[PDB]
Design a protein around this ligand. Structure first.
Ligand SMILES: *C(=O)[C@@H](NC(=O)/C(=N\OC(C)(C)C(=O)O)c1csc(N)n1)[C@@H]1N=C(C(=O)O)C(=C)CS1
Length: 261
């Protein structure tokens, strides 16, 4: 397709490896670029952990209101919210919001721990039919993004399908699904990524990620005007370990999609 050709041109010009999956829910068509290759998720994996905790809350009724102690040993590399509550508590709802909306890595580790470790996050993915996602490490090391390493990876196609099931489909109960969508719409870290390639009148929920190798990721549910919602995954990684982040490349991928489909 013409969109695939433009994504290939974008990838070649940008000097990296680009993975894109678009689902258009108006007609369930899919546009993929390297859609079945594995990419490091980086912090985009926080969506799966938050969703798995919401799933737990369907049977543990007010689990989201439970206080969780934040201890010094919990702090990692980037903890903009949790660092204000060390030797205190945050609820699981507060940890989920911090993880999703600020990409707080300590908050993510509390979610992972609440699920029984990275294997528990992966088990949730399997339970909703995602056979591709794998979470193998906690924060911060899940973001190393070393080429050739299959840990903490998924494919664009699998992640787009899962994000659709979580936000638009039936993987979560109605209250939980609404809560996930509210959290994603409130993300603070995505203004330069997929959102920057879309008209400002469209509504977006997204979760970013970044890591070594200039890895720059974003996954989004988009509610345009005038048409049904879209699900878009954009993953990008580069050959040099200390390559600079390219959020603008993701914005350009989103613009190609939003103009071409
Ligand atoms: C999610 O992807 C998280 N990423 C990281 O913790 C790591 N790096 O983030 C960047 C911004 C690239 C950094 O230079 O520190 C990381 C862990 S281990 C390793 N070798 N790199 C958080 N989420 C993002 C995001 O893109 O949403 C951030 C900007 C903060 S960290």
């Amino acid at each position: 397709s013409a969109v695939q050709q433009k994504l290939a041109a974008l990838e070649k010009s940008s000097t990296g490896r680009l993975g894109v999956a678009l689902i258009d829910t108006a007609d369930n068509t899919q546009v993929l670029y390297r859609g079945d290759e594995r990419f490091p998720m980086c912090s985009t994996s926080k969506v799966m952990a938050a969703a798995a905790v919401l799933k737990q809350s369907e049977t543990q009724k007010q689990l989201l209101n439970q206080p969780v102690e934040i201890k010094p040993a919990d702090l990692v590399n980037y903890n903009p919210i949790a660092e204000k509550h060390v030797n205190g508590t945050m609820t699981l709802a507060e940890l989920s919001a911090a993880a999703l909306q600020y990409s707080d890595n300590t908050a993510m580790n509390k979610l992972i721990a609440q699920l029984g470790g990275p294997g528990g996050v992966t088990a949730f993915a399997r339970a909703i039919g995602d056979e591709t996602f794998r979470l193998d490490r906690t924060a911060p090391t899940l973001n190393t993004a070393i080429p050739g390493d299959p840990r903490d990876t998924t494919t664009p196609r699998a992640m787009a399908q899962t994000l659709r099931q979580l936000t638009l489909g039936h993987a979560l109960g109605e209250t939980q699904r609404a809560q996930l969508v509210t959290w994603l719409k409130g993300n603070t870290t995505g203004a330069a990524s997929i959102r920057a390639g879309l008209p400002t009148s469209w509504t977006v929920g997204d979760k970013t990620g970044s890591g070594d190798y200039g890895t720059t990721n974003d996954i989004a549910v988009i509610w345009p005007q005038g048409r049904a919602p879209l699900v878009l995954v954009t993953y990008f990684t580069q050959p040099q370990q200390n390559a600079e982040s390219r959020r603008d490349v993701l914005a350009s991928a989103a613009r190609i999609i939003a103009e071409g489909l």
